[PDB]
Every structure is written in structure tokens, then in C-alpha cells.
Amino acid sequence: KSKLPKPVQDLIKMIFDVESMKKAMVEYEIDLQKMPLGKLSKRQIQAAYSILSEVQQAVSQGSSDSQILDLSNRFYTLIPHDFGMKKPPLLNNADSVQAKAEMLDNLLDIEVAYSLLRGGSDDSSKDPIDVNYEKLKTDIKVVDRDSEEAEIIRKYVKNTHATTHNAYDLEVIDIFKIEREGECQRYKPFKQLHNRRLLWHGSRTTNFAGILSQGLRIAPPEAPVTGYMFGKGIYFADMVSKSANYCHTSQGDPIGLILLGEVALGNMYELKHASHISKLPKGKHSVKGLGKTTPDPSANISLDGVDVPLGTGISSGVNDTSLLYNEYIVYDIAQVNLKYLLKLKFNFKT
Numbered sequence: 001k002s003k004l005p006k007p008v009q010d011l012i013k014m015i016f017d018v019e020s021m022k023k024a025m026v027e028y029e030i031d032l033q034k035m036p037l038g039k040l041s042k043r044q045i046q047a048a049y050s051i052l053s054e055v056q057q058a059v060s061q062g063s064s065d066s067q068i069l070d071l072s073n074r075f076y077t078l079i080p081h082d083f084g085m086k087k088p089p090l091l092n093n094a095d096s097v098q099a100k101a102e103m104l105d106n107l108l109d110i111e112v113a114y115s116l117l118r119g120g121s122d123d124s125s126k127d128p129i130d131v132n133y134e135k136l137k138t139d140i141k142v143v144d145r146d147s148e149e150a151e152i153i154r155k156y157v158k159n160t161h162a163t164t165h166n167a168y169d170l171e172v173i174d175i176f177k178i179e180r181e182g183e184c185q186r187y188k189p190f191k192q193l194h195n196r197r198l199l200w201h202g203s204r205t206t207n208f209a210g211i212l213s214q215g216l217r218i219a220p221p222e223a224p225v226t227g228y229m230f231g232k233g234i235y236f237a238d239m240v241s242k243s244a245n246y247c248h249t250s251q252g253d254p255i256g257l258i259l260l261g262e263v264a265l266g267n268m269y270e271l272k273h274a275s276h277i278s279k280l281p282k283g284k285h286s287v288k289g290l291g292k293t294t295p296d297p298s299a300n301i302s303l304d305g306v307d308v309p310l311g312t313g314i315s316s317g318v319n320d321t322s323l324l325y326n327e328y329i330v331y332d333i334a335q336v337n338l339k340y341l342l343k344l345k346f347n348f349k350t
């Protein structure tokens with residue numbers, strides 16, 4: 001039997017749940033009979049991203065819907081979708097490209113999680129929770145509820161739930177302190193950079209075995225850059241609810257996971273509208289998407305020499321922006337040092 005704390009054991013059970021991986025694929029309208037979990041490969045995902053990039057070019061160059069039908073069918077050939085003896089919807093627009101790139105980004109994390117379960121050793125004398133914990137190459141510790149670090153984290157959650165995300169409220173169940181093997185060493189060129197901030201990143205529970213083993217990653221070269229608002233980077237928010245929306249929890253599955261990462265932002269390239277960039281302008285280290293609302297800067301605090309923007313939301317004074325809240329993007333995986341993982345209960349009012 002495992003000696004791991006019960007909250008860590010429950011976390012491991014959650015992120016390696018095979019039935020949850022299947023459900024995520026069903027949600028993504030994938031045909032499980034034609035493409036089951038075991039059949040998912042990096043090669044097929046990579047080939048589907050390329051078709052998506054082909055669709056991105058045909059949509060921008062104003063190709064006919066007749067010409068687009070063949071690229072759309074090509075996509076469904078690589079990634080079977082659930083329809084039956086039916087005709088699938090046309091991938092003939094930017095919204096379609098964006099939704100399919102988002103789906104493939106999720107399939108990459110699910111493939112990692114499933115490859116970790118199949119690629120190891122089999123020993124019935126060891127607790128399978130202990131076996132799976134070791135596959136993550138991450139030290140996971142429970143943060144004491146009464147500590148100052150837990151108080152700062154709970155205040156950050158409490159103060160940054162946006163009014164426009166009023167459909168649910170959040171309850172912090174567990175706070176974990178996480179240390180991914182070799183991540184601190186990788187972060188070393190950025191450890192003293194200015195503007196280091198503790199920011200949120202939400203994701204589906206089915207992505208966390210991939211996030212903990214491989215860290216936060218950028219979409220591959222084959223992925224269509226126009227499929228992402230600020231291009232292929234790693235996205236963060238300073239508002240908990242903006243990130244919690246990415247958990248995709250529901251009344252039937254209300255437990256979600258969200259990260260707190262130290263992000264070395266440096267000189268930020270400030271943007272108000274979409275810019276599908278391939279690289280940053282010289283001297284810039286990140287992108288800050290300017291929101292209409294920002295946490296109150298007078299309420300900024302320090303937790304281990306890093307800024308924590310835990311103030312309640314106030315007007316940023318920024319006009320004519322496509323964003324309600326800020327977002328931060330980095331384009332080098334080394335600019336992120338994952339610090340905490342929170343298990344949250346969503347209480348829906350709807």
C-alpha cells in the first residue's frame with residue numbers, strides 16, 4: 001500500500017483515469033470505434049495538424065468550398081469523427097481551424113498519458129498509485145492549509161474571480177507544491193530576469209499527466225499559427241476564473257485542476273488584438289494581451305521574490321481591446337517554472 005498522502009493519491013488516480021481520457025475524446029466528437037485510445041499516435045496528430053495548416057491557407061487565399069471539401073475530408077480521414085453513414089461538417093473557416101487545433105493540442109497530452117501507462121513495467125506487488133506517481137518525474141507535496149503560502153494562494157483565488165464568470169464559484173480542495181525534475185535547471189537563464197510573475201494556467205484533468213511529465217509545451221511546427229490568438233506560445237492569466245474556464249468542468253464532473261507557474265516575462269510586447277506571430281520583436285521576452293480589467297496593482301505582493309497580482313479587478317484604462325482580461329504568452333518553454341497545482345471544486349449556479 002502507498003505511503004503517499006491521500007490527496008496526492010487522489011490526484012494520481014484522477015490524472016491517469018483511462019475512462020476520463022475516452023470521455024474527453026467523445027466530447028471532441030472522435031469516433032472511438034475507428035480511433036480508440038490505443039490507436040492514437042504522435043505521427044497521426046502531426047499529419048492532422050499539417051492538413052489544418054493546409055485548410056488555413058485555403059481559407060485565407062479564398063479557395064472555393066468545392067476545393068475545400070477535399071482538404072476537410074483529408075482531415076477526417078486522419079482523425080475519424082463520430083457521424084455514422086452521415087456527412088461531416090465542412091472545415092471552411094478560421095473558427096473551424098481554431099477548434100480543431102485546440103482538439104489536437106489536447107490529443108497530444110492524452111497520447112502522452114496513455115503512453116506512460118502502456119510503456120512501463122508490470123508488478124502486482126507495488127501499489128499502482130506509487131508506480132504511476134513515479135512516471136510523472138515530479139515531486140508533489142501537500143501545502144499545509146494553515147501556512148502563509150496557502151493563505152497567499154487562497155487570497156489570489158478569492159480576489160481574481162471575474163464578475164463576468166459568475167456562472168460558478170470556486171472552492172480550493174487541495175494545494176500541491178510541485179517540482180518537475182530538471183525544470184529549475186532549465187529555468188536558470190531566466191531565474192533573475194525582471195518581471196517574474198506568478199500566473200495561472202488551467203487545463204482539463206486529462207492533460208495533467210502530460211503537463212507534469214513533459215511540462216507546459218508549445219504547439220508543434222506543423223500546427224497552424226492562425227489557430228492561436230497570439231501564436232504558438234504558452235498562455236497564462238492573472239485572473240483565476242479566466243484560467244478555470246479552461247478546466248472544462250460541468251455539473252457531471254465539477255472537480256478541476258489549475259496550475260500556478262512562475263513566468264519570466266521580462267520586456268512585454270503589449271497587444272490589444274490578435275497577432276499570429278512566429279517570433280517576438282527584438283528585445284521582447286513575452287506578449288501581454290491587454291485586458292479591459294486588471295488586478296489592482298497597489299495590491300501586488302511578493303512570494304519568494306516573484307510578483308503575485310492578487311488584487312481585485314479594476315479598470316486597466318485600456319480602450320479598444322479585444323480582451324476583457326489580461327493574458328501572458330511566452331514562446332520559450334524555459335521561461336516557465338511550475339510551482340503549485342490546485343484541485344478546485346466548481347459550484348455551478350446554473
Ligand SMILES: CCc1cc2ccc(CN3CCN(c4ncc(C)n4C)CC3)cc2[nH]c1=O
Pocket residue numbers: 105106108109200201202203207217218219220235236237242243244246327328
Ligand atoms: C489565458 C489562460 C489560459 C489559456 C489557455 C489556452 C489553451 C489551453 C489548452 N491547452 C491544451 C493543451 N496544449 C498542448 N498540449 C501539448 C501541446 C504541444 N500543446 C500545445 C496547451 C494548450 C489552456 C489554457 N489555459 C489557460 O489558463
